[PDB]
C-alpha cells in the first residue's frame, strides 16, 4: 500500500506541483484538454483535484475545400483554410471559424491548378 501510496504520492507530487506551473499535455494529469490549471484541497489522507478540461464541441456538417485556384496557380495554405458556413467563403482556422480576406499576407502559393482532381476555380 505504501508503494501504491508512493506511486500515488509521486503521482500526487507530479499532479499538484507541475499541475500548476505550466501547460502539461499528458492525459490523466490535469484535464482532458488544453491544460491550464487545477485546484487542490486537503483531506485526512489525500487530496482532491478538479481539472480544467476545455473542449470544442457541438459539431455539425458544414463544408470545406481542398484547394482554390487563382489566376492559374493552386493554393495549399499555411494558415487560413478554405471553408464555407453555407453562404459565404472565408479563410479560417483548424478548430473554429474566424474570417480574413484572402491576401498575400495570410495565404501562400504552391503549384498550378491543372492536375489535382476536385480543384475549384476562383
Amino acid at each position: 500500500r505504501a508503494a501504491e501510496i508512493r506511486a500515488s504520492a509521486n503521482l500526487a507530487a507530479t499532479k499538484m506541483s507541475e499541475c500548476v506551473l505550466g501547460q502539461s499535455k499528458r492525459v490523466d494529469f490535469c484535464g482532458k484538454g488544453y491544460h491550464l490549471m487545477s485546484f487542490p484541497q486537503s483531506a485526512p489522507h489525500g487530496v482532491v483535484f478538479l481539472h480544467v478540461t476545455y473542449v470544442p464541441a457541438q459539431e455539425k456538417n458544414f463544408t470545406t475545400a481542398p484547394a482554390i485556384c487563382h489566376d492559374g496557380k493552386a493554393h495549399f495554405p499555411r494558415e487560413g483554410v478554405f471553408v464555407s458556413n453555407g453562404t459565404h467563403w472565408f479563410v479560417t482556422q483548424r478548430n473554429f471559424y474566424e474570417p480574413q480576406i484572402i491576401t498575400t499576407d495570410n495565404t501562400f502559393v504552391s503549384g498550378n491548378c491543372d492536375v489535382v482532381i476536385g480543384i475549384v476555380n476562383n
Binding site: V27, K32, G33, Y34, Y54, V55, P56, A57, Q58, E59, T64, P66, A67, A74, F76, P77, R78, V81, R94, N95, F108, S110, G111, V115, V116
Partner: protein, 165 residues
C-alpha cells in the same frame, strides 16, 4: 476486481465505439490491417489471430474477465477507429471530423503542403509499406512476445509452484 478495473482502465479510454466510414479514400493510402475487417465475425485484425495462437485443480479457480475477449476486441477496434479518422483534436475537443488529407499536410507541417497534393502517393507509401513490412514482420517473426509470455509463464509457474507446494 482490480484486474477487471485494470482491463477497463487500459481499454475503455473513449466513451463510445467511434468508427471510421468503411470506404478508405485519402489519396492512396494503404493500411489494410489497422482497421479490422467487419466481414470477419471476429472484428479483429489478422495479427490478433496469430497472437491468440502464438501464446501457450483444487480451488485454483479462474474467473473469466468481465470485459470478455470479444468485447475486448470490440474495444480495441474502436481504439483503432478512434485515432485514424478523427486526428489529434478530440482530446482537445469533440470527436468531430476534419479531412485526413489536409490532416496529412498539417501532420506534416508541424514537422509545406506542396509536397502532399503533388506527392500524395509517396508520402503515403512511406508508412504503408513500412507498416506493411513490420506487420508482415509481426506475422512472420515469432518470439517477439517475450513479456506477456514472461507474465503468463511466471504466473503459470507461480500457479504451478503453488500447486507444487
Amino acid at each position: 476486481v482490480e484486474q477487471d478495473k485494470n482491463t477497463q482502465e487500459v481499454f475503455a479510454q473513449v466513451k463510445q465505439i467511434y468508427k471510421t466510414p468503411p470506404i478508405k479514400d485519402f489519396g492512396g493510402f494503404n493500411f489494410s490491417q489497422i482497421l479490422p475487417d467487419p466481414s470477419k465475425p471476429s472484428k479483429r485484425s489478422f495479427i490478433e489471430d496469430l497472437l491468440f495462437n502464438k501464446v501457450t485443480f483444487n480451488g485454483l479457480t479462474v474467473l473469466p474477465p468481465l470485459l470478455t475477449d470479444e468485447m475486448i476486441a470490440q474495444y480495441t477496434s474502436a481504439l483503432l477507429a478512434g485515432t485514424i479518422t478523427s486526428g489529434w483534436t478530440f482530446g482537445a475537443g469533440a470527436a468531430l471530423q476534419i479531412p485526413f488529407a489536409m490532416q496529412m499536410a498539417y501532420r506534416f507541417n508541424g514537422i509545406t503542403q506542396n509536397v502532399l497534393y503533388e506527392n500524395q502517393k509517396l508520402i503515403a507509401n512511406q508508412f504503408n509499406s513500412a507498416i506493411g513490412k513490420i506487420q508482415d514482420s509481426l506475422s512472420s517473426t515469432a518470439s517477439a512476445l517475450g513479456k506477456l509470455q514472461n507474465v503468463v509463464n511466471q504466473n503459470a509457474q507461480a500457479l504451478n509452484t503453488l500447486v507444487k507446494q
